[PDB]
A paper describes a structure:
[name], a nitrogen-fixing bacterial symbiont of legume plants, encodes an essential [name] ([name]) with no sequence homology to known enzymes with this activity. High-resolution crystal structures of [name] show indeed a structurally distinct, dimeric enzyme, with some resemblance to glutaminases and β-lactamases. The active site of [name], deduced from structural comparisons and confirmed by mutagenesis experiments, contains a highly specific Zn2+ binding site without a catalytic role. There are two Ser-Lys tandems, all connected through a network of H-bonds to the Zn center, and three tightly bound water molecules near Ser48, which clearly indicate the catalytic nucleophile.
The orthorhombic (OP) and monoclinic [name]/MP2 forms show similar packing pattern with solvent content of 49.4–52.6%, whereas the monoclinic form MC, with a significantly different arrangement of the dimers in the unit cell, has 53.2% solvent content. In all cases the electron density maps have excellent definition for almost the entire protein molecules, except short disordered regions at the N- and C-termini. In the close vicinity of the Ser48 hydroxyl, there is a characteristic, almost tetrahedral pattern of three closely-spaced water molecules w2, w3, w4, visible in all crystal structures, except MP2. In all structures, regardless of the hydration state of Ser48, the side chain of Ser48 is also H-bonded to the Nζ atom of Lys51 and Oγ of Ser80.
Author numbering:
A (entry chain DDD), B (entry chain CCC): 3 to 352
The structure:
C-alpha cells in the first residue's frame, strides 16, 4: 500500500495525519494517476447524486414536468438549506402536484454555519423540505409518479424507482449489480458503495458527455442527459451547495471547465472537460478525479482536492487563488498568532 | 507497525477508519499494554494541564491566595464556558488582584454545543475569561505575582512561569529537556509534545500520589501537590469540563477511582488508583492510560477510551453504562433509522 497523507502540524510538530486515496481516470475509466488505494471500496454518499439524477431524468414521463437546469442542479445538490433552496424544493414538488408531507427525508442542521446561526437565532426547526437531499427526493417522487408507481414508498429498495437507481449506478460504473453494495443514507434513501476509481469514472463520463454535446455529436438519450446534468451543475453551482461552500466556489472559479461534488464523510468527485491541462496529463478526452479522506475530515478534503488541482495543472494560479482559504486552512490561535499549518507529503503515482 | 483502528460502518460497509495509539503504564511508566505506536511523539495539548497545575501549585506563595479545590479543578480544565466557569475565573482573578486585561488567552466558541447555541441566540462575543483554559491562565498569573515576576509576559518561554512549567513537564515524564518539543497552544501558551507513553506516566503518578495520600503515607511536597490535583479533579469534575461532557460524566461515574482529561485533537489521559482491576493487569500500584486518535476525531476518541476501560476491566458494566452514548455513538438518520455503528478492530498487546 502507498503511504499518502495530508498532515497538520503545531510549530512543526505533527498534530494529525489523514490518509488520502485518489483516482484520476480517463473517459473510459482507465487509471492515469493515483494516491493511496484508488480502488478502495467507498460509500460515494452525495457524490453519487449525478447518477441518481440520471435515473430520475431517464424515467418515462419526467420530461413532462418541465424541470429546468436549476431544478436538475438541485437534484445534484447537497445544498445549504438557504431560503432559495427551500423555495426551489417547493417549486419542484408543485411541478409534480406533490406536498412536503410526501417527502421521506428529514431535516437536519444546515451544512452552512451562517444559515444554521440564522436558524438558531430564530428558533427554526428544519423539516423534510430543508434536507440537503430535498431535490434528489423530489426527483425520486417525480419518477415514481411519472410511471404510475406508488409514491408512499418511493425511497424503499423494492420500489421500481430504487430498482432504476441501482441499475443506473452499476451501469455508469461499468460494474455488475453484485459489485455495488448498498446501505441507507442520512436522507433515508439507498446509497451505493463501489471502488473509488469508478466514482471518478462517473464524473469522467459526465464531462465526456458535455464535450460530445458541445461538438454537436449524435448522442443517446443517456449521453444527452449526462451532458444536461453537467451543464445544470456548472450553470447553477449555487444550487449544488450555496454561498461560501467549496463546491460552489470551485465551480464558479472554473466557469464551465469542470463540475465538482462533495460526499458526506469526505469523498469528492470532479469531471473535467477536455482542455490543455487534460492533454498535458496524457489523455485525448475528458478526465475524472475522485478522492476519499480515510478518516472522514472535510477540512482536509477541500485542502487535498485544491492541492491535487494545482499538481494536475488544472486551472491557473489565478483561478485556484479563489480557493486559497480551503487550500491552506487558517491555523491562528485565539490571540491572532499562527501556530501551525497543513502540508501535503503525498506523491501522485502514474 | 500494528494495525489498530476504530471504524464506522454504514450497513456493514466501511465508512471511515481511524488509527489508534495507546499506552497503559504502571506508576514508574513501565509499558504494560499498547495499541499502535505507544511512543508516538504527541502534542498533549489540554491533557498536559495537570502538569501545568503542578507547576502553579509548586510556585511559592500561591497557597496564600486561598484557591480552593474547585479553583484547582478549573486550573486543570478544558471547561465549557458555562456561567459558573466564567464566574469562578473572575473570582480567581479577584483573589490575585488581577484583571481580564492581564490574561493573554482569547475567547472562542464554547466546547459545549448547548452553551454555544445560547451564545449565538444572545449575540454573545466570548472574551478572555471565557477561554476553556482561563483557569490555567489565572494560575500562571497567580504564580507570576507570587514570585514578584512581571505579569505582562507570563505566557512567553523566557518567563519564569514557563521555565517552571518546562522543567516540571520533563521531570514528570522522566525526560531530558531536549526530548520534550514545544509549540504554541490555542490559548497562546507554550504546549509540550513528548512520547505518548509519558502522558500515561504523568497520570499514573497523579493516581499513585492519590493512593499515597489516602493511605496516610509520608509524602514529598510534589506527591502531596499531585494528590491535591487528583482530589480536586475527582471532587469537581464539572469544573474540569461541564454538563454533558465526557470528562465530567466519566469522573462522576467512577466516583474517585480515576481522573481523566481530554487534549484537543483527540488525546486523552487517565490516572487509575490501585484496584482489583489494576492488580489483574499485572501491577501492584496505580495505572496510567494515554490515547491518541491519529486523525484527531473526538467522537472516536471517547468511543475508544470507553472501550479501553471495558477491555482493561476498569469499573463495572454498571459504572461504564453511564458512558454508553460515547462508547457506541448513535448512527441514526434524519428519519430515526439506524444506518450503522462503530467497531473496534484493535488488539491490546502486552
Ligand atoms: Cl443544509
Ligand atoms: Cl491554535
Ligand atoms: Zn441523500
Ligand atoms: Zn491552554
Amino acid at each position: 500500500p502507498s503511504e499518502d497523507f495530508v498532515v497538520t502540524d503545531r510549530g512543526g510538530i505533527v498534530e494529525n495525519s489523514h490518509r488520502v486515496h485518489a483516482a484520476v481516470v480517463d473517459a473510459k475509466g482507465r487509471l492515469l494517476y493515483a494516491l493511496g488505494n484508488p480502488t478502495r471500496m467507498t460509500l460515494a454518499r452525495s457524490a453519487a447524486k449525478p447518477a441518481q439524477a440520471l435515473a430520475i431524468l431517464e424515467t418515462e414521463g419526467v420530461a413532462g414536468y418541465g424541470f429546468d437546469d436549476a431544478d436538475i442542479a438541485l437534484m445534484c445538490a447537497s445544498h445549504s438549506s438557504e431560503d432559495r433552496h427551500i423555495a426551489r424544493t417547493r417549486a419542484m414538488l408543485s411541478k409534480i402536484k406533490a406536498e412536503e408531507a410526501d417527502l421521506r427525508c428529514g431535516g437536519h442542521p444546515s451544512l452552512s454555519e451562517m444559515v444554521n446561526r440564522s436558524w438558531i437565532k430564530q428558533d427554526f426547526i428544519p423539516t423534510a423540505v430543508c434536507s440537503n437531499c430535498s431535490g434528489k427526493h423530489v426527483g425520486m417522487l417525480a419518477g415514481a409518479r411519472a410511471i404510475g408507481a406508488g409514491t408512499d414508498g418511493y425511497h424503499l429498495p423494492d420500489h421500481p424507482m430504487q430498482g432504476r437507481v441501482k441499475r443506473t449506478v452499476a451501469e455508469l460504473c461499468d460494474l455488475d449489480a453484485g459489485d455495488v453494495e448498498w446501505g441507507t443514507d442520512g436522507c433515508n434513501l439507498p446509497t451505493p458503495a463501489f471502488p473509488l476509481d469508478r466514482l471518478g469514472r462517473i464524473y469522467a463520463k459526465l464531462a465526456s458527455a458535455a464535450d460530445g454535446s458541445d461538438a454537436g455529436e449524435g448522442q443517446s438519450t443517456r449521453c444527452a442527459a449526462l451532458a444536461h446534468i453537467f451543464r445544470a451543475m456548472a450553470r447553477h453551482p449555487e444550487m449544488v451547495a450555496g454561498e461560501g461552500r467549496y463546491c460552489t466556489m470551485l465551480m464558479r472559479a472554473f466557469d464551465g471547465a469542470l463540475v465538482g461534488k462533495l460526499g458526506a464523510d469526505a469523498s469528492y468527485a470532479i469531471g473535467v472537460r477536455a482542455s490543455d491541462a487534460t492533454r498535458q496529463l496524457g489523455t485525448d478526452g475528458a478526465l475524472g478525479i475522485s478522492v476519499k479522506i480515510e478518516d472522514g475530515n472535510l477540512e482536509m478534503l477541500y485542502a487535498v482536492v485544491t492541492e491535487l488541482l494545482e499538481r494536475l495543472g488544472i486551472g491557473s494560479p489565478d483561478v485556484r487563488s479563489q480557493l486559497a482559504s480551503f487550500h491552506h486552512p487558517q491555523r491562528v490561535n485565539t490571540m491572532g498568532v499562527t501556530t501551525g499549518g497543513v502540508s501535503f507529503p503525498f506523491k501522485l503515482r502514474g
